[PDB]
Design an enzyme around this catalytic site. Structure first.
Site, PDB file in Angstrom:
ATOM      1  N   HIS A 262      -3.810  -2.563   4.735  1.00 43.59           N
ATOM      2  CA  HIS A 262      -2.559  -2.114   4.550  1.00 43.59           C
ATOM      3  C   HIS A 262      -2.322  -0.629   4.834  1.00 43.59           C
ATOM      4  O   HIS A 262      -3.320   0.026   5.052  1.00 43.59           O
ATOM      5  CB  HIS A 262      -2.121  -2.361   3.150  1.00 43.59           C
ATOM      6  CG  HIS A 262      -2.869  -1.439   2.057  1.00 43.59           C
ATOM      7  ND1 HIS A 262      -2.417  -0.066   1.844  1.00 43.59           N
ATOM      8  CD2 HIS A 262      -3.974  -1.481   1.338  1.00 43.59           C
ATOM      9  CE1 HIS A 262      -3.132   0.346   1.073  1.00 43.59           C
ATOM     10  NE2 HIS A 262      -4.081  -0.556   0.684  1.00 43.59           N
ATOM     11  N   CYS A 280      -9.502  -2.225  -1.160  1.00 46.77           N
ATOM     12  CA  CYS A 280      -8.788  -2.557   0.247  1.00 46.77           C
ATOM     13  C   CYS A 280      -9.183  -1.668   1.417  1.00 46.77           C
ATOM     14  O   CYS A 280      -9.803  -0.712   0.994  1.00 46.77           O
ATOM     15  CB  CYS A 280      -7.229  -2.166  -0.173  1.00 46.77           C
ATOM     16  SG  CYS A 280      -6.490  -3.674  -1.231  1.00 46.77           S
TER      17      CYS A 280
END
Ligand SMILES: [Ca+2]
Length: 334
Positions: A262, A280
């Site tokens: 992301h 992440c």
């Protein structure tokens, strides 16, 4: 003589066959219940007749011999749901997934009721992720261009403890190009390869030493233009030390445990150098948008050389971390 006259609880997953020997036919028919609607338009060839139409739950039917009998009266029905969707193009990592809306007591029967056809043909096997959901995949990643047909013929199938399939479902899908992105903690670079060739490199910041990104093979799931990443959804309370609540753009999910690729404008300086996230893969807003636009469901992310352990094979998107011998042996039965 596939059913006896007087018989009850006759199952409707199988056709109802009649057979001669030594002899010839007929003159064969079946009627009707409802209703009275008539039979399954017959069949060839010399010595046997079979139903074409599939039978309902809780019916009498009439079938030289005459045979009157009644079909199953299920106590419970479960509906299967099949992914990926009909007509979809997916990456080389996409398993077939059949999810039931009930816990399945007889996994063996559910597997027998599912028919998977590949072109070109390749061997695969089933593995259950939980009580409700079973996956099928080959030993290696799918060959690009492979066509897959899935027939979940659960209607009339006894799935254990009085539970029957509520309907049949089908999907047909296709495998696209081989897309494999490697995130290598040695270089802190995420490299996207298409059929073995580099097409894009992106500096990344992965999970810091206390909340590292697990190594292993991740399957691309859903993608989101914008999403609120809330740790509570992955078991961790927002106001705890490793908690968080973070608006994010261009987020592509690669594990049910909560790892995404992301946009991470706050760690652009660290990307390529220092791991700062909770697990992440942070990349730049334009690299994330690129990923979102170009990577599809079933494509692969491989993470290597982190200080983490290995992604669990039953994460939900971690299927390829289970060794083949284990996957193939299955967990429907001992
Ligand atoms: Ca039900």
């Amino acid at each position: 003589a596939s059913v006896t006259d007087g018989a009850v609880g006759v199952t409707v997953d199988a056709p109802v066959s009649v057979t001669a020997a030594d002899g010839v036919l007929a003159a064969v028919t079946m009627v009707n219940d409802n209703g009275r609607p008539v039979a399954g338009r017959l069949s060839p060839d010399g010595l046997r007749w079979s139903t074409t139409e599939q039978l309902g739950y809780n019916r009498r039917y009439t079938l030289t011999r005459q045979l009157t009998f009644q079909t199953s009266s299920p106590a419970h029905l479960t509906m299967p749901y099949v992914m990926p969707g009909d007509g979809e193009v997916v990456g080389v990592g996409e398993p077939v997934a059949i999810r039931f809306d009930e816990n399945i007591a007889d996994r063996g029967a559910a597997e027998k009721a599912i028919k998977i056809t590949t072109n070109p043909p390749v061997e695969g096997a089933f593995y259950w992720l939980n009580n409700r959901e079973v996956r099928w995949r080959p030993e290696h990643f799918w060959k690009p261009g492979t066509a897959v047909d899935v027939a979940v013929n659960t209607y009339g199938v006894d799935l254990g403890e009085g539970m029957f399939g509520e309907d049949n479902v089908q999907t047909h899908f296709t495998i696209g190009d081989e897309v494999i992105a490697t995130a290598d903690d040695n270089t802190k670079i995420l490299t996207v390869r298409v059929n073995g060739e580099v097409v894009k490199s992106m500096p990344t910041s992965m999970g810091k030493d206390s909340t590292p990104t697990a190594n292993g093979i991740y399957i691309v799931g859903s993608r989101y233009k914008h999403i609120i990443m809330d740790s509570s959804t992955y078991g961790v309370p927002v106001n705890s030390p490793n908690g968080y609540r973070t608006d994010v753009d261009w987020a592509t999910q690669i594990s049910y445990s909560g790892v995404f690729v992301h946009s991470a404008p706050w760690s652009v300086g660290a990307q390529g150098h220092t791991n700062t996230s909770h697990g992440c893969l942070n990349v730049s807003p334009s690299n994330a948008q690129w990923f979102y636009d170009h990577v599809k469901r079933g494509d692969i992310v491989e993470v290597v050389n982190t200080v983490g352990g290995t992604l669990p094979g039953i994460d939900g998107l971690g299927d390829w971390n289970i060794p083949w011998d284990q996957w193939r042996a299955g967990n429907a039965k001992a």
